[PDB]
Design a protein around this ligand. Structure first.
Ligand SMILES: NC(=O)c1ccc[n+]([C@@H]2O[C@H](COP(=O)([O-])OP(=O)([O-])OC[C@H]3O[C@@H](n4cnc5c(N)[nH+]cnc54)[C@H](O)[C@@H]3O)[C@@H](O)[C@H]2O)c1
Ligand SMILES: NC(=O)c1ccc[n+]([C@@H]2O[C@H](COP(=O)([O-])OP(=O)([O-])OC[C@H]3O[C@@H](n4cnc5c(N)[nH+]cnc54)[C@H](O)[C@@H]3O)[C@@H](O)[C@H]2O)c1
Ligand SMILES: OCc1c(F)c(F)c(F)c(F)c1F
Ligand SMILES: OCc1c(F)c(F)c(F)c(F)c1F
Ligand SMILES: [Zn+2]
Ligand SMILES: [Zn+2]
Ligand SMILES: [Zn+2]
Ligand SMILES: [Zn+2]
Lengths: 374, 374
């Protein structure tokens, strides 16, 4: 048995920015009250994890990163009621405490217990469950999925279907749900509409999926890497454009293509310039633009507010707007019921030990999602 | 008797920025096909007219400004079907052509025939109906209401109730409808919500009226002129704050006052800094901020897109989001049935000949709306 005992296990520790992960032994404390310790099964590599490496996202280091995963409960702390040992679970990088003003709001999902806004890199109680070479190691978003075992707060875990294939449904933990929800929930894409999707990675592809599910008539994929276009068309893009092919700015191109601007645009990259471009390419009176990409830390964009005064709507969201604990189990049920596909997002499957190789595939442009298997 | 003939009449001509209006004779050509010539009865002084004088808003000069007015049709050009001589009418500074993609859209109002985005200062046909000292004079927003007679395109005029009091309902041509609609239509303020309204002039007071009509529980007025607070409370503000009273930035003050951010905020001034402050003070996960104020020409704001990524919605609108020709007659009918009040906005009445005094009253801080009578 491991319950109630420290587990020594393998994890990918990030000791400093812009270096490879170090795959080594860590100690994982048992769960305290209202905590859950999880044996990981599969985790995706999301660009947001790479942002921690690159310094685009600032979070305390050293850290066990990883936030897009699924596993099996090994043990529960006192007072846990929502999962039990042996349950398949998804860690929730956006918690759902159920008690804060946001959780109580019909349209809110960015629970005030989150560790995104002002990251502490700890459990809810302000401490860590991880040590490595005698040193405390920070958590990431209350999840820390790049480890054979993690400990998460109860509000940051959802029980999912016991028959779920974890090597697929781990994508519901971030990139699928984010993109899909950004389209169907946050933008509320309409039937017959024209959409523009900037960035054709795992998240942007999931946005296309959502736009197609919502009945859009046209879905224009935008990426500087034309190798991304074939898969974008496979999941619903009607046209793809590479800004580098044009002498004019792509907002002008998109405005012309859509005979005066698109209905819905999505920024799914993380650049200030493409956030402004994506807003501009939506129709000036009734267009909607949704920011999904994560921009570099502490940088402001510049824009002309006449873009909004004419009638545009500009919004952003975390995790597709989904209230995380309510939504994740239903998303996995819907996957099980064949309501959407995840295989189109999965280009590589590697052992966890090849995490660095997985990141190199992302950075080179060659992968969509690599799934790491423990 | 005047039908088909040039009319000589008095108008307020703006020959140069930052100068008084010149009340002097102009020649008003008869209406061409699908044009309407109107004898003005009353016009308000909106801060946007002052923006033309100050160069905040750039439109070709020399110009006959004025856009918040009502009058009586003197004559119609060939092919006009929607008004007749003797009808009471409101010129529509936002046209409604009824044929463009925006007019056809359920939520659009910024008709593509507008002369706001890239002002030409002409009729729809690219020419002017005004001569002064033998020189052609620009129109403004297709309305040019600072004249005893104007000529407007048919798509820029609405027939209103024959029993309407024109010296009141002129405010439905801009400031009331803009503010009221910004709350009820654009923001869609909810019952029991907390609102913050930046700027307590005629438009911001009309925002407050709309928030109260929508059932808001708290409506916090924000103005640097505390003399504006009493009227704001009369029309529904539950409390008023002056940023100059506080050591801390007002977005922090309002976030504290609202126990974590407001539901709905409105920028009703026209400053880049308050547009960003108003966004920031709405709750980060589900707040909505509406830009109403007109920014200084060609200037960009700077903001951190994390404010949107967490879940905020940022939007703007012209004319409260109302489809102008459909909505203005209904608003007049509702006013006649006492569904809202206009007198709280009217602080001063002057003859048209005293237009400069009316602008002095606005610039000093003393007035909300001065109504000029022809
Ligand atoms: N809001 C959320 O909750 C949330 C969730 C998941 C991911 N993200 C962010 O979403 C973004 C996309 O994530 P991902 O899909 O995993 O990343 P990704 O797989 O790197 O995809 C990004 C795509 O953008 C393309 N691209 C790069 N620069 C440009 C450009 N200038 N113009 C057009 N295309 C360009 C690039 O070729 C790539 O295909 C990242 O910034 C993530 O951090 C946010
Ligand atoms: N979107 C539209 O369709 C539309 C329609 C009508 C008016 N407008 C614009 O809306 C704005 C307000 O018009 P109005 O009500 O006629 O003008 P107004 O009467 O000048 O009211 C503006 C108020 O803002 C206050 N103010 C100025 N600076 C600050 C500050 N830093 N912080 C807080 N309050 C401040 C000021 O004291 C005044 O009471 C102007 O920019 C107009 O051009 C837009
Ligand atoms: O990919 C999801 C994701 C985000 F959307 C963030 F905004 C963020 F800060 C982060 F760390 C993250 F993982
Ligand atoms: O006050 C209404 C109003 C506006 F909202 C503008 F954006 C504008 F350019 C203008 F000239 C105007 F009069
Ligand atoms: Zn919560
Ligand atoms: Zn992610
Ligand atoms: Zn139109
Ligand atoms: Zn106005």
């Amino acid at each position: 048995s491991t319950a109630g005992k420290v587990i020594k296990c393998k994890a990918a520790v990030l000791w400093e920015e812009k270096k490879p992960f170090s795959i080594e032994e860590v100690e994982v404390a048992p769960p305290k009250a209202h905590e859950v310790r999880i044996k990981m099964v599969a985790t995706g590599i999301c660009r947001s994890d790479d942002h921690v490496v690159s310094g685009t996202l600032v979070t305390p280091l050293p850290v066990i990163a990883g936030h897009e995963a699924a596993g099996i409960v090994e043990s529960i702390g006192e007072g846990v009621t929502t999962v039990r040992p042996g349950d398949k679970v998804i860690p929730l990088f956006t918690p759902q405490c159920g008690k804060c003003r946001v959780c109580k709001h019909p349209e809110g999902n960015f629970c005030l217990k989150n560790d995104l806004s002002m990251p502490r890199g700890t459990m809810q109680d302000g401490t860590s469950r991880f040590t490595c070479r005698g040193k405390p190691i920070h958590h990431f978003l209350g999840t820390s999925t790049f480890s054979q075992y993690t400990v998460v707060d109860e509000i940051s875990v959802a029980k999912i279907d016991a028959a779920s294939p974890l090597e697929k449904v781990c994508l519901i933990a971030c990139g699928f749900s984010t993109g899909y929800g950004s389209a169907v929930k946050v933008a509320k894409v309409t039937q017959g509409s024209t959409c523009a999707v900037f960035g054709l990675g795992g998240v942007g592809l999931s946005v296309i999926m959502g736009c197609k599910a919502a009945g859009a008539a046209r879905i224009i994929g935008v990426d500087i890497n034309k190798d991304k276009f074939a898969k974008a068309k496979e999941v619903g893009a009607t046209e793809c454009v590479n800004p580098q092919d044009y002498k004019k700015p792509i907002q002008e191109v998109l405005t012309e293509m859509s005979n005066g601007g698109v209905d819905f645009s999505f920024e799914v990259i993380g650049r200030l310039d493409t956030m402004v471009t994506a807003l501009s390419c939506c129709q000036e009176a009734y267009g909607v633009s949704v920011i999904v990409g994560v921009p570099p830390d502490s940088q402001n964009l510049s824009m002309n507010p006449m873009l909004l005064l004419s009638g545009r709507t500009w919004k952003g969201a975390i995790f597709g707007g989904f209230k995380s604990k309510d939504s994740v189990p239903k998303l996995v049920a819907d996957f099980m019921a064949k309501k959407f596909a995840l295989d189109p997002l999965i280009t590589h499957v590697l052992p966890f030990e090849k995490i660095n190789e997985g990141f190199d595939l992302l950075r080179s442009g060659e992968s969509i999602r690599t799934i790491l298997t423990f």
